[model samples]
Target: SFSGYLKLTDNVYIKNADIVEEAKKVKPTVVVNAANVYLKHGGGVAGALNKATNNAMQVESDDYIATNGPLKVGGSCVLSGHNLAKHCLHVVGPNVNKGEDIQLLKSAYENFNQHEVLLAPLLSAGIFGADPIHSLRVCVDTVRTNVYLAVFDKNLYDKLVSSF
Candidate 1:
């Protein structure tokens, strides 16, 4: 029934609410969104993996492993991130204008289920294009919300993976 009423709680809607509500009987959830499989500061990709994990960042050291940035030009798949994630999977395609992208989302969810104890970032809603930096948001919501989008192309996805 909570169809995202335009309130402050738009961000608090929990997935698998049944399980979450049960778990929440004891305390509050400290949710953070780490979108995009982005680069570390100072043009450093090598240490990016370690820094994320050591800091316990949302994107995760394990999640952003193998080291890298710009998860893709626009697609949902990410190579270096798959290496970094404690558990990771990318599902891209069907462009924003297209409405049948659910399959990718479904598959990614299936993979998530298979990979027990999976943790998604709140800001995994990665952007694309040569200027992905402009539209990109490397926060926790994209990851937590499982923003696994499949853009029209895989060039971005491929490029990021090639970094490894």
Candidate 2:
């Protein structure tokens, strides 16, 4: 239906629709992707956008930053390339091999709020194996702007709404 916004809070909100389909419609200023320590857009949501932009997102692949040194867990970096929106915020969150607290997702949102318009997928909900509802719940509670969630499944959307 691609026709509603869920007001999760005063400043934060979530929009629901088929992810890649709605993403092009929303035309957000920024798109957040689940990134690894190397910030590689090889698979999952990151890989899709990588192909969408005709490989433009790759220019910023060298921009991964880690406060604790090598691995990018709990760290985030913003990247830009041709037709990839204004920028893309690449964030590393909890995964199968590595573990991280929910705080890192919140921190990623802190960085995301700097931009006006935003669209993000549920991190780790793709190939990384985190709970989709839980992942996006963090986004709903933490964002400082009206964000389009770009959900890829209706069941997930219903579950998210049921949570509230």
Candidate 3:
């Protein structure tokens, strides 16, 4: 549970823990919420963040999709008014059966320019149930913005460190 980081830069690293737990620790200005097109704030980091923000996340999410059209797979919405942070980037992730959730991730990160101490989840893992190691590899390798990956599985996090 004490796995360290694969430090990509002075600002970026991949670390292990429940994303919400780690986000609380750092109180990041932005938190990336791995979500689906439905914007169901019921499980995973979405649920956690929604609770922490007192459902303020849902209000923004609804407004975002209404204006921008339903977030298809590989699209994202930037939401504000959340209590835990100033912004939440909600990405509609790929289903595990279909794979390639990283495409969605790439799209989401494309919109993000910068933030101080961003906290992110292992996209495509958890409810979407993709392999964490593989998903995280694409994440760390592709996303240009600085982030800290908050991982739930210590074993997968360890593997990433060893391999990196």
Candidate 4:
């Protein structure tokens, strides 16, 4: 079940839940994958999502790259959601420590706003090393359509809830 953590706007929400589980239930919704420029589903959110889809997502990601070239930071690509979601939006977020601008993180979220319902994790906040609170803020400010910021970590969830 999704626990409502905060409401960013009429269409944007923060929820404490696993994005994979929640995405499975929300039909016709796009699951935003926190992807790298290469769209490799090696670990973290991408790996879990690819695993859930039996690696079909990875294959599609490979094809997408081969056909359209590599995605730049803040760039996005859409993939067919094998058996779990309606679709998947892969957004390459910035690695802040690598001198990537934090504003690129906001652009990452912005690209997915075209979808009516989006299930997203905190982009760049994992191995990419972005600040959770600030990333959450970027998500809140950038989403223009119905979006659910599905937070998987309890510590981050607690901090988000307390901070707000």
Candidate 5:
């Protein structure tokens, strides 16, 4: 399910070692208690992984699994104008407070260790608030530290940070 690629136009830096190699490192036959914690809303659809060419598809957790048929989930990049990452990984920080984002981040170790092959454009990262620092911090941290972050726009940033 967490197997896809993000078509990065700028640069593709390998964070935790090469992706394919990373995948080979953590190939588990089964996963238990697999969680998709969000800082706020795992939402109707935020913690899943999928591959959408355009921004017109409902991203299901396992959209790229092996049965994207009948369902026919495909579209353009809703977030980015360009291709939604050669692969798409939709991840977010765990529900904030009480050290939740931390836990959500820890799970990434498992992701990088195993399903690293499906490297999405950069999940858990966004650019909101028109504050480059905040957005960059989250984005940098997400990739550099293998943690999940929410990158969006100024309005979205304000909404998310002010919510609850």
Candidate 6:
């Protein structure tokens, strides 16, 4: 329901809005999920996107994990998008409490740089316990393609805008 925009570089810009709705609006080439290694679609961005897709994503995610094994930290997998986007890129962020490095988080964002247009949440900022601002900064600095940040928090949006 909230919306804002910031240009990080000449080629990269960030949009803050309801990611699920934005996916429908912009129809980005790919929508990025802030997923866990299991790809559970349990809560946060993962659950919302799965709900938007009527659990189709969850079905594919289960199939993917069964076939490919659990995704590693900083690794990613792709799924066919349903109703909201053409594709979905699921990236696993590091759990900092487990001594995972921020570099792995950076790699999560970088994984989708090949896509021309993308909608992504701040990876690792949710249950993974990453600092929201730090995660946002990593996302801003790492993406080489046009990216929309699906930020549903007004306070986080304010801080992110002020940071740059």
lDDT of each: 0.29, 0.68, 0.70, 0.82, 0.29, 0.82
In candidate 2, what are the lDDT values of residues 21-63, reduced to their tens digit? 5556655667777777777778888788887877767654754
> Candidate 5 or 6, higher lDDT?
6
Pairs that collide in candidate 4 are none
Candidate 2, 88: how far from true, in Å? 1.3
Model 3, runs deviating above 4 Å: 1-11, 98-117
Query: What is candidate 1's lDDT per residue for 1-164, written digit by digit as tens?
Result: 23211221322222322212222231212211222334332212223332443444434434554544445312333323322342223323222233333223333233233322322322223321122221222211233332222122346434432432
RMSD of each: 14.1, 3.5, 3.5, 1.9, 13.2, 2.4
- What would the TM-score be for candidate 6 when compared with the true structure? 0.90
Candidate 3 local distance difference test against the native: 0.70
lDDT of 6 by residue, 1-74 (tens): 22456766665556657789888877777889888889999888889899999999999899988998999999
Candidate 4 accuracy as lDDT: 0.82
True-vs-predicted CA distance for residue 81, candidate 6, Å = 1.3
RMSD of 3: 3.5
At residue 103, what lDDT does model 2 achieve? Answer: 57
Residue pairs in clash, model 2: none
Q: Residue 81 deviation, candidate 5, in Å?
A: 13
lDDT of 3 by residue, 11-46 (tens): 558776777776666666778888888787887778
> Each candidate's TM vs. the true structure?
0.25, 0.78, 0.78, 0.91, 0.28, 0.90
Superposing every Cα of model 4 onto the true structure, what RMSD results?
Answer: 1.9
* Residue pairs in candidate 3 whose N, alpha carbon or C atoms collide under 3 angstroms: none
Q: Sort the predicted structures by lDDT, highest score first.
A: 4, 6, 3, 2, 5, 1
In candidate 2, stretches whose alpha carbon ends up further than 4 angstroms from where it belongs are 1-3, 62-71, 101-103
Q: Please write out the lDDT profile of model 5 over residues 38-83, one tens digit for every residue.
A: 2111222232211122222233333432343221111111121113
Candidates 4 and 6, the one with greater TM-score: 4
| Clash totals in order | 32, 0, 0, 0, 27, 0
Q: What does the lDDT read for residue 70 in candidate 5?
A: 27
